[PDB]
């Protein structure tokens with residue numbers, strides 16, 4: 001079984 | 017009143033969607049129109065949702081905006097796609113609740129006798145998708161869906177809101193939202209019919225007729241006849257293209273653009289522009305379902321002998337029997353003959369002469385390099401599609417090429433044979449009729465496999481046998497003069513011949529390449545050398 | 551503009567959004583002749599082109615070429631001529647006294663067509 005490929009990511013910003 | 021006083025059906029310019037609009041009015045607006053006393057007596061609740069869907073360019077947005085215009089109430093709120101997402105946490109729900117805050121306030125202030133509020137969501141699938149089946153990068157989408165579900169139907173009851181949602185892929189929407197109380201009425205918009213295609217064409221041409229800018233030779237009914245499978249958007253595009261073609265004839269560009277302005281005040285649109293546009297500019301996005309009979313019949317049919325008429329009459333009789341019978345919903349027939357006899361063209365003609373709603377032809381030309389499973393899947397799909405219509409006719413040609421037969425060993429594919437043998441005896445659903453026409457060139461091989469008994473009848477397609485038929489065929493084609501015809505007759509009339517029409521055409525074309533003083537001789541040799549056959 | 555028209559969403563191609571669909575393909579002999587004439591106007595105007603160069607012969611010969619390839623052929627031909635007045639043995643030096651009277655001949659075009667530029671289509 002071929003291991004799952006790499007993935008991107010999504011980011012969320014927070015305000016102080 | 018709740019309805020604009022000047023509103024009427026005719027003013028919204030909608031096309032052939034009579035039934036759908038009537039169903040909407042019945043199932044969505046019946047309750048609000050009756051006096052409060054009786055509706056209170058029943059004590060029934062009111063609808064709050066609608067979900068339009070269908071293929072692109074059918075009128076969903078037009079219908080939604082026309083419904084908005086029809087109703088007299090607050091200006092509808094529009095959510096233009098995924099404009100509600102924000103990077104800061106918790107602000108998407110802020111907007112999704114700001115939308116409904118005003119309606120909540122009004123209902124609180126006035127109670128049951130308050131006005132109505134309408135909210136329109138466009139590209140709903142962008143926002144609302146299954147909570148479980150989603151990206152794990154952020155839980156923002158799930159929180160949004162939960163907020164919407166809570167607001168639309170939560171512990172607090174709100175009953176003066178109507179929400180309209182339009183999409184193109186209804187499957188992706190979450191199941192929890194498409195339940196009674198949120199969106200129970202769900203319509204499907206589809207391609208129009210001939211009457212709808214006439215009404216649509218009428219709605220746009222109106223102004224040109226009003227101002228006398230359309231030539232009298234234009235027949236709208238004919239245009240509606242030709243334009244098959246088109247949609248409203250494509251019809252409007254065709255009209256625009258014809259207009260542009262008509263307009264282009266008063267400008268001299270390509271060095272510097274100018275306009276006449278004195279010969280340009282007598283403009284008119286003829287039927288030629290429509291014909292030109294229908295072949296060059298606009299092609300139907302939905303692939304034409306009509307078969308390309310020109311490809312299969314590339315040189316027409318010529319009556320060189322009785323057998324042609326006999327075969328056509330037999331085909332007509334079979335068509336009549338399958339059309340006017342109830343004890344035998346399924347019928348089959350096989351056409352057999354020597355190679356180069358024209359079986360495919362005759363089968364195509366027989367199929368065309370009938371006027372069945374559904375007609376399709378399955379050929380190996382498309383199945384190049386396919387495995388023995390892909391062919392089975394394709395045949396299954398074709399037959400499944402055929403099953404839907406009330407009357408169906410299907411043609412299977414070149415059977416031996418469909419089984420991958422080779423006389424060495426021999427070899428063939430068993431799975432396809434079994435699938436065909438099962439599909440030749442499966443009756444369609446109740447109250448439907450199907451006809452199957454098969455073509456082949458080797459009857460003994462089929463006899464060996466014991467499938468010749470699966471068919472109901474057989475028809476024989478002979479090839480030219482006597483010199484008189486050859487002379488008649490030459491006369492019909494008219495490729496030689498009287499002197500050459502006499503010269504050829506002087507020899508051929510003595511004996512018999514055995515040749516197929518396709519090979520005859522090839523021989524004629526090969527012969528016509530020589531100089532005039534030799535062509536006839538070149539012909540005779542080709543007939544003598546290749547003509548050695550029973 | 552795209553190179554893979556069949557990967558685009560269908561909803562974007564219906565009339566009213568993107569109607570005019572156009573295909574740009576390889577030119578024919580007349581198009582090749584026109585293109586070749588376009589890219590050689592300045593040299594002819596300034597008398598930098600030799601009198602033995604025949605455009606029609608090149609147009610007939612250059613088969614399966616595209617516009618970029620024709621421009622590249624002209625550019626290589628131009629450099630083969632400029633290189634005859636430079637000395638890159640030890641120190642890069644230019645003549646500057648024979649640079650004037652620079653001319654482009656048919657031999658340069660022929661040489662550039664056999665060792666520098668090769669089409670990427672069909673048999674050759």
Ligand SMILES: Nc1ncnc2c1ncn2[C@@H]1O[C@H](COP(=O)(O)OP(=O)(O)OP(=O)(O)O)[C@@H](O)[C@H]1O
Pocket residue numbers: 029030031032071072073074075076077078079184216219247248249252561564566
């Ligand atoms: N039934 C119709 N009657 C009259 N005009 C129509 C009809 N259907 C389409 N048209 C014309 O085609 C245009 C396209 O229709 P519309 O914008 O409503 O499509 P849509 O289904 O909402 O689009 P999509 O699914 O591509 O987002 C309409 O504005 C109108 O110009």
Ligand SMILES: Nc1ncnc2c1ncn2[C@@H]1O[C@H](COP(=O)(O)OP(=O)(O)OP(=O)(O)O)[C@@H](O)[C@H]1O
Pocket residue numbers: 312313314315316317318319320324354355356357358359360361362457517518
């Ligand atoms: N009277 C005719 N009957 C049949 N075909 C005809 C007739 N007159 C002309 N033709 C043309 O003869 C051509 C030969 O027909 P077709 O290719 O269908 O033959 P076929 O017997 O199925 O061939 P094959 O042996 O190669 O499988 C077709 O283009 C058909 O249009």
